[PDB]
Scaffold this active site. Structure first.
Site, PDB file in Angstrom:
ATOM      1  N   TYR A 120      -8.460  11.831   5.770  1.00  0.00           N
ATOM      2  CA  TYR A 120      -7.409  11.648   6.762  1.00  0.00           C
ATOM      3  C   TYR A 120      -6.300  12.647   6.423  1.00  0.00           C
ATOM      4  O   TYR A 120      -5.727  12.589   5.346  1.00  0.00           O
ATOM      5  CB  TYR A 120      -6.910  10.211   6.651  1.00  0.00           C
ATOM      6  N   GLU A 151       2.031  16.339   4.661  1.00  0.00           N
ATOM      7  CA  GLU A 151       2.211  17.729   4.299  1.00  0.00           C
ATOM      8  C   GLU A 151       3.155  17.678   3.092  1.00  0.00           C
ATOM      9  O   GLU A 151       3.665  16.610   2.732  1.00  0.00           O
ATOM     10  CB  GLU A 151       2.846  18.512   5.454  1.00  0.00           C
ATOM     11  N   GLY A 170       6.081  13.155   4.647  1.00  0.00           N
ATOM     12  CA  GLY A 170       5.084  12.131   4.406  1.00  0.00           C
ATOM     13  C   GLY A 170       5.434  10.894   5.204  1.00  0.00           C
ATOM     14  O   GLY A 170       4.660  10.453   6.051  1.00  0.00           O
ATOM     15  N   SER A 171       6.611  10.343   4.927  1.00  0.00           N
ATOM     16  CA  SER A 171       7.105   9.151   5.609  1.00  0.00           C
ATOM     17  C   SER A 171       7.533   9.536   7.011  1.00  0.00           C
ATOM     18  O   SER A 171       7.466   8.734   7.945  1.00  0.00           O
ATOM     19  CB  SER A 171       8.326   8.580   4.877  1.00  0.00           C
ATOM     20  N   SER A 191       5.871  11.318  20.613  1.00  0.00           N
ATOM     21  CA  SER A 191       4.676  10.772  21.264  1.00  0.00           C
ATOM     22  C   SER A 191       4.001  11.771  22.215  1.00  0.00           C
ATOM     23  O   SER A 191       3.090  11.406  22.955  1.00  0.00           O
ATOM     24  CB  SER A 191       5.037   9.498  22.043  1.00  0.00           C
ATOM     25  N   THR A 246       1.445  -4.792  14.155  1.00  0.00           N
ATOM     26  CA  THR A 246       2.348  -3.989  13.344  1.00  0.00           C
ATOM     27  C   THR A 246       3.182  -4.857  12.398  1.00  0.00           C
ATOM     28  O   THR A 246       3.231  -4.619  11.194  1.00  0.00           O
ATOM     29  CB  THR A 246       3.280  -3.160  14.233  1.00  0.00           C
ATOM     30  N   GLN A 270       2.154  -7.706 -20.532  1.00  0.00           N
ATOM     31  CA  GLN A 270       3.043  -8.522 -21.352  1.00  0.00           C
ATOM     32  C   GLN A 270       2.330  -9.605 -22.140  1.00  0.00           C
ATOM     33  O   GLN A 270       2.554  -9.753 -23.340  1.00  0.00           O
ATOM     34  CB  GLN A 270       4.120  -9.188 -20.490  1.00  0.00           C
ATOM     35  N   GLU A 286       0.260   4.975   2.328  1.00  0.00           N
ATOM     36  CA  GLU A 286      -0.034   4.166   3.514  1.00  0.00           C
ATOM     37  C   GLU A 286       1.284   3.602   4.020  1.00  0.00           C
ATOM     38  O   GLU A 286       1.324   2.569   4.686  1.00  0.00           O
ATOM     39  CB  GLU A 286      -0.997   3.012   3.199  1.00  0.00           C
TER      40      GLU A 286
END
Ligand SMILES: CCCCCSCC(=O)SCCNC(=O)CCNC(=O)[C@H](O)C(C)(C)COP(=O)(O)OP(=O)(O)OC[C@H]1O[C@@H](n2cnc3c(N)ncnc32)[C@H](O)[C@@H]1OP(=O)(O)O
Ligand SMILES: CCCCCSCC(=O)SCCNC(=O)CCNC(=O)[C@H](O)C(C)(C)COP(=O)(O)OP(=O)(O)OC[C@H]1O[C@@H](n2cnc3c(N)ncnc32)[C@H](O)[C@@H]1OP(=O)(O)O
Ligand SMILES: CCCCCSCC(=O)SCCNC(=O)CCNC(=O)[C@H](O)C(C)(C)COP(=O)(O)OP(=O)(O)OC[C@H]1O[C@@H](n2cnc3c(N)ncnc32)[C@H](O)[C@@H]1OP(=O)(O)O
Ligand SMILES: CCCCCSCC(=O)SCCNC(=O)CCNC(=O)[C@H](O)C(C)(C)COP(=O)(O)OP(=O)(O)OC[C@H]1O[C@@H](n2cnc3c(N)ncnc32)[C@H](O)[C@@H]1OP(=O)(O)O
Ligand SMILES: Cc1cc2nc3c(=O)[nH]c(=O)nc-3n(C[C@H](O)[C@H](O)[C@H](O)COP(=O)(O)OP(=O)(O)OC[C@H]3O[C@@H](n4cnc5c(N)ncnc54)[C@H](O)[C@@H]3O)c2cc1C
Ligand SMILES: Cc1cc2nc3c(=O)[nH]c(=O)nc-3n(C[C@H](O)[C@H](O)[C@H](O)COP(=O)(O)OP(=O)(O)OC[C@H]3O[C@@H](n4cnc5c(N)ncnc54)[C@H](O)[C@@H]3O)c2cc1C
Ligand SMILES: Cc1cc2nc3c(=O)[nH]c(=O)nc-3n(C[C@H](O)[C@H](O)[C@H](O)COP(=O)(O)OP(=O)(O)OC[C@H]3O[C@@H](n4cnc5c(N)ncnc54)[C@H](O)[C@@H]3O)c2cc1C
Ligand SMILES: Cc1cc2nc3c(=O)[nH]c(=O)nc-3n(C[C@H](O)[C@H](O)[C@H](O)COP(=O)(O)OP(=O)(O)OC[C@H]3O[C@@H](n4cnc5c(N)ncnc54)[C@H](O)[C@@H]3O)c2cc1C
Lengths: 385, 383, 385, 385
Positions: D123, D127, D131-132, D181, D316, D339, D366
């Site tokens: 996928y 770049e 990213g986000s 879009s 979503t 721990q 993701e």
């Protein structure tokens, strides 16, 4: 009154430790972490730059500085890499038993060489079966004439295979009913004596350049002139040592936390998203603010703990509080730093994934997070009656 | 050199405040919380005891104490009741703007009158439509002759219905783009002046004996002689204030937390479950240890911010860290103190539920927890 | 297969409870929080609207609904006021011991009248000296012929002075060495019987309109006909009542939490600061997101606990998780809800300060946060041995 | 109504993946981690067992399973190693874009070859400079006759150097002011195409055996018949893909967490300190209980998110919550599992330290932790207007 000012002499050591950290430790930290090689060159610089063996009384060649100073210098070191720093601080840890539980000759002998040449020493308490539970160590010592025959195993010993001598805690009273305050004995054991068998270098997640390993003591002969205060005084010496050395440890953590904060901040002013720097996003701003706040608060806790013991009072309480808080926030900031870096922070080409790996150890050695809570709880409650 | 040692003069002020809180404030704090009546009696005992207006300089009868000293006294006070203590601090908050911004006359006139008799003043900045966005208040002020006609309202003013005089922030410049640093003017206003319409006592969840309410100003007239430093230096006088008040405010939250810690600890040493004392169940021991830890850290944070300002150094950075932290752990310690008490903790006949109700305010006034972050980020990304 | 769908019928119950709560409860809950007055008017209307005694078997005039059903209704009710809701849900708590521990006759008598008249009942286990430790209770029960003499006192009893009958747990075996599973007996005691001394209404910080008071039992004579399953099977019945009743309590905290989220969410879209709605400040966006997150997750956990017990399987593990989590996040959202209101939030003229006061109790009654962890730890660890 | 029961078929899938995972992945996971060698043997094996490409329509040789099914299978896998599981799951990620946005021909061509031979796909969105902020990618695509010339750089691509074909998102409208879009288009690109330059393997902290690297695209020619739905529909296809692939990534986190919890539990039932087994110390039992609580809640969340989409509803809101929460509790559980192990937990000779290096990625890829809050906040506010 109150004073958070540094003496001019302290501002000196700090500048020295700082330069050494940002100019010598930082350019090579990444490679020593990858190769797990013992940082011999850096340990020599720190030695001739007077940043090591700080606590050794000047009555033997040392600078005779105090726990406040050790933390002060150590925080600058840890900022570079807590791997090199732990190896360095390990020396203090092993020396302290001699400073508070040894006689003149023992200190002149084993502490003196430390200021004369760049040797290392180690602290030997932990065993495979017991670590947090010091009262459960099974390594023994029996008296034969004017000697002691020592048999047992030590695990996870820092500077373990690189020390000239070791501070060794062994059970001397066979009676299972024997109380902790009378069944142990601190010995100062030279590393080359016939019977000590150094194991392999353990491979851990963080502080990789640091030497940590197991050791087997088989029929080790130790001359009576090597028992610290006396047969049965080992536990108190062990407890006293931790109170003295936990503050510097906590300082190491804040040093690591500082490093995380600076990195996170630097990157936050370079990377752009949605048209603006990461720091221009309120979400990230609060993250950065919550990080800074925590490093300041942890630094205060160790300064308070150092000052306390330095003034001559028992600091068990403050010491544990600083160790606990600094350790926890060292980890929190480590991961948040990786976080602001995004994908890059998960990558080894960047400085933060190493910080997250080195940080986990602070919640474990020199008393785990849990054990510290048991200590603080026992001191707090003792005040109400 | 490093020192966490109090001077003999402070181990003296502290002994006094501690005594006044343990022996006098604590046995009545409960009923004042219930009824909610302005604890005039206690405020008289504080005054005549030296524990009030502690910041007014000798030149006017005040003890001229420093910020560190002020925090040491406050912690002891709050430990008794943050309701009573807040009444007390609302005084120095109204005073500081005069100490740092007013000339000799104004200072002698309004600060001097506070050392002669147990009077109360108030700080009026907040309005209905703006509390955090201080640069967004609308209370106007238009000059006429040697007077300023003030019109507008304020809200949540502590000691609002019990004050002799008020420090008051108003917008002098009526220009939209007027640069905040020149659009506002501070005024020391008297409560007895025409046009000053005081409101009803606002009822809240905690710190109930304290007096807080809205005040509407309608054509109040102020003689130019009351204008603090000058027409326009308002924002500066108001801002410069926080650098001195925040430290004490955080020491107050710490006193509360100290009280909660003590209550829970004593109970844990008394109540027994499963053949064990509450404090013997490792689960509770850890709770206790974490509470101790937070109290000790919050205390150090304010001592640092106080010493910083007492040294002449600007202390916004450290001040906000102490205020932000102290507020949080005060609320966390209150709820855990109620937790160790069990069903009792939730009950009115016990001391902890009050603390939980009081604490919440520390996260709201004198700059919210969110605003304290905005400042810590600004100062940090500044160093 | 997996399904998070509501059956058409459940969609009806929910719409009823919801309307009732938003049109009738909300409009008056604030006054009741002030006056502390029992909400008889709302209880009456809740009874006729079929929102009470939901679990009583059709054999005795009830809806025959299940725990999943009992929870869907409670969350809606709690949204209005957990003060009112806890009064209503207390009836269920007191009724369960009969439903799962009594014979046909006992269920006809006491469970039956609840469907005919809006009476109330109560669950009496906790004493002044033992709550979390039920095996600690000291109120005794003595067999005198065809009767039992009960003596002791109970504290913090919901619907305590408004109940028609009570479920009572009393140690029936004096032997201190007797197992808890064999040492107790559950009875059904009618309030009007001579010897039941009802205490004063206790004043609390939250859920102020709910009746909670102490009760002493002085030589109360109960007939053997009112012993639940048998003498000595009282401990299991109570343990069984908690697994069945803990899920609705959790669903209760979710209602309060959902209420807090809406209030704060509606304000944040209204109040403006620094030229923007609160909601447009990322710092508040993230705050709101975390609240939403916690409410959704808490709702899911009680649904999983209801389904488990509804499918005929012991649900201790899941009930405890749901109760523990819902309680912790119901408290977290209350203080954060007050927080977004700011000044107003701290004022009693706004609906959120009450939420903060009501919420704290969820971490105490029906098993405190600490006990929940003990239970959870017991269930979890048993699966590895 | 409500159900949490697995259909008999899912019980089969699950039992298979569990077996494969605990007896084939676990035994070699530590080795692939130390070398970072791509696990071809395990991938070929997984493909054989039908634990791969699960979501491909059955009219293309696929099982035609759903998201819930993918989550059920991934959790078991991740338990053995999220390094191995990410390589497998990265395949689904690459396929979804075709499943929801490609025509019949494209699907039989690309999704078809996957069922016939154990190939791999990737996928390509991220770049180095975005990213986000998906709307900020610069990879350009221009239309020259019957084809598109692709120019750009991608970074951090899972299976990047092991893919047969790639899903690539590029901007097809030079107009900077064009909506997000309408400015991107999704192409399906064959890796053997001239102009595709594979980068070397990136070295990260966790999931080291997973293949991740950057990829340059110099004048990469692509037939117009490779445009997924049409020019400008790129943003929605990518957004649509994340909603379907977010529950699975969340399920991977709870698998890693479950693994942490089990190791921690089994060790607490063995290590002994102060005379008791660790699990006997209440401070430790409380820790285990909280750990257990989170896993159950994280699992419950992705189950709700998967079910919502399988039902044909935009999920979503639920997807981001499950992804956001599981991500956090995985990191919490990882460090706490270390721990309970003590010094050992910090050592590479044990399983836990790896779990800690792996978990940190779940808060990054993701959709980062912060980005999930942005989504949750927005979807939430949307419900109040
Ligand atoms: C970066 C720098 C380099 C560092 C590299 S890593 C180096 C290391 O990790 S060194 C290894 C660290 N080891 C630990 O942290 C162990 C933690 N455990 C403990 O501290 C104690 O066992 C304990 C759990 C606190 C105590 O357990 P107990 O067995 O129950 O002892 P007690 O019964 O409480 O006490 C027995 C007697 O000892 C006395 N005592 C306890 N604490 C103190 C202190 N602080 N000072 C002095 N004496 C103390 C106690 O009073 C008892 O005495 P009596 O006279 O009999 O009444
Ligand atoms: C114990 C309990 C007793 C009972 C007590 S009840 C009393 C109260 O609750 S206080 C009254 C209510 N008001 C508040 O709480 C306000 C909280 N503060 C804020 O939110 C501010 O918006 C803010 C976030 C602090 C600032 O936001 P900004 O709008 O962005 O302005 P700044 O950028 O901070 O400042 C602009 C000018 O102010 C000057 N400045 C800034 N910092 C300082 C310091 N530290 N000292 C002095 N002056 C300062 C600065 O010079 C700027 O102007 P110039 O143009 O450079 O002249
Ligand atoms: C509805 C909303 C409106 C009203 C709101 S307010 C209403 C209320 O507050 S009612 C008061 C609630 N009281 C509590 O929550 C007390 C919490 N404490 C406990 O749950 C138990 O003491 C405990 C901690 C779980 C147990 O402690 P122990 O004494 O140590 O018992 P154990 O040794 O664990 O067990 C002893 C025997 O009991 C059996 N047992 C335990 N759990 C169960 C379940 N779940 N089912 C069946 N049996 C159970 C256990 O098996 C032991 O017996 P065996 O002989 O082995 O058979
Ligand atoms: C286990 C598997 C193995 C492999 C593991 S590694 C795999 C990977 O790393 S894949 C790469 C992951 N990258 C990300 O997750 C980035 C996250 N960013 C985002 O999701 C969005 O940019 C955002 C932040 C949510 C949105 O930002 P914006 O730029 O501001 O977009 P908007 O302006 O909000 O919206 C623009 C239009 O898109 C529409 N939109 C948004 N969400 C959706 C959904 N869910 N469905 C459909 N359409 C959607 C929105 O309605 C807007 O519409 P208009 O028509 O323009 O009005
Ligand atoms: C890199 C490294 C360097 C080290 N260097 C040295 C050195 O130089 N000198 C030296 O002497 N040692 C050293 N150690 C050892 C370290 O100090 C010990 O490993 C640690 O204190 C040992 O405890 P444990 O591992 O046995 O843990 P244990 O505590 O026995 O078991 C693990 C878990 O048990 C918990 N636990 C134990 N008892 C309780 C209780 N009663 N209540 C609640 N929780 C409890 C702990 O908190 C912990 O999470 C080093 C270790 C490492 C990893
Ligand atoms: C092992 C691995 C495998 C990967 N595999 C793939 C793959 O197969 N396909 C693919 O397409 N990608 C893949 N990626 C990339 C991953 O999806 C991206 O790395 C991640 O989305 C990139 O964000 P960034 O690194 O640019 O972070 P940036 O967000 O740009 O910067 C770092 C910080 O900024 C914060 N931030 C950014 N914007 C905002 C905002 N508006 N508000 C608040 N905070 C903000 C983030 O939360 C973060 O903490 C992989 C990454 C890794 C590490
Ligand atoms: C008991 C009591 C006594 C008081 N006494 C006095 C007094 O004597 N004198 C006086 O002047 N005032 C007083 N006040 C008022 C107090 O100072 C104000 O209530 C507080 O500063 C007001 O903020 P606000 O209520 O307007 O909140 P606002 O902040 O405007 O709105 C509520 C929420 O917005 C959040 N928020 C706002 N802006 C931002 C941003 N940019 N980023 C992120 N989050 C943001 C806040 O954190 C808060 O949670 C008192 C209040 C109380 C409750
Ligand atoms: C409004 C209200 C309504 C109520 N209604 C009812 C009712 O209808 N019926 C009924 O039976 N009861 C009722 N109760 C009582 C409630 O169930 C009990 O108050 C609670 O379970 C009592 O425990 P305790 O207060 O004795 O707690 P205690 O446990 O004695 O003390 C409180 C503290 O001890 C801690 N603690 C105790 N043991 C341990 C341990 N072993 N390990 C670790 N921590 C431990 C607890 O976690 C807690 O923080 C009600 C209570 C309230 C406040």
């Amino acid at each position: 009154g109150f004073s958070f000012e540094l003496t001019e002499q302290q501002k000196e050591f700090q500048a020295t430790a700082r330069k050494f950290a940002r100019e010598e430790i930082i350019p090579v930290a990444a490679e020593y972490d990858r190769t797990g090689e013992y940082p011999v060159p850096l340990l020599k610089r720190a030695w001739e730059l007077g940043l090591m063996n700080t606590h050794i009384p000047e009555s033997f060649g040392g600078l005779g500085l105090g726990i406040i100073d050790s933390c002060l210098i150590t925080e600058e070191l840890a900022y570079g890499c807590t791997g090199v720093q732990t190896a360095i601080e390990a020396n203090t840890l092993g020396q302290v038993p001699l400073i508070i539980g040894g006689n003149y000759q023992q200190q002149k002998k084993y502490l003196g060489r430390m200021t004369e040449e760049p040797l290392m020493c180690a602290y030997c308490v932990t065993e495979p079966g017991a670590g947090s539970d010091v009262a459960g160590i099974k390594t023994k010592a029996e008296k034969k004439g004017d000697e002691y025959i020592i048999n047992g195993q030590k695990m996870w010993i820092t500077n373990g295979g690189k020390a000239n001598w070791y501070f060794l805690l062994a059970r001397s009273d066979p009676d299972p009913k024997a109380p902790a305050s009378k069944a142990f004995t601190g010995f100062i054991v030279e590393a080359d004596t016939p019977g000590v068998q150094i194991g392999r270098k353990e491979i851990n997640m963080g502080q990789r350049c640091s030497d940590t390993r197991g050791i087997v003591f088989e029929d080790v002969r130790v001359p009576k002139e090597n028992v610290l205060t006396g047969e049965g005084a080992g536990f108190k010496i062990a407890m006293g040592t931790f109170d003295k050395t936990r503050p510097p440890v906590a300082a190491g953590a804040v040093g690591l936390a500082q490093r995380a904060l600076d990195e996170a901040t630097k990157y936050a002013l370079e990377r752009k998203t949605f048209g603006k720097l990461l720091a221009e996003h309120q979400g990230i701003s609060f993250l950065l603010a919550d990080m800074a706040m925590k490093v300041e608060l942890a630094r205060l806790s160790y300064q308070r703990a150092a000052w306390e013991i330095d003034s001559g009072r028992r600091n068990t309480y403050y010491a544990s509080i600083a160790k606990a808080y600094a350790a926890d926030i060292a980890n929190q900031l480590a991961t948040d730093a990786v976080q602001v870096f995004g994908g890059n922070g998960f990558n080894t080409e960047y400085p933060v994934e190493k910080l997250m790996r080195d940080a986990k150890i602070y919640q474990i050695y020199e008393g785990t997070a849990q054990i510290q809570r048991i200590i603080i709880a026992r001191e707090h409650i003792g005040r109400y009656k």
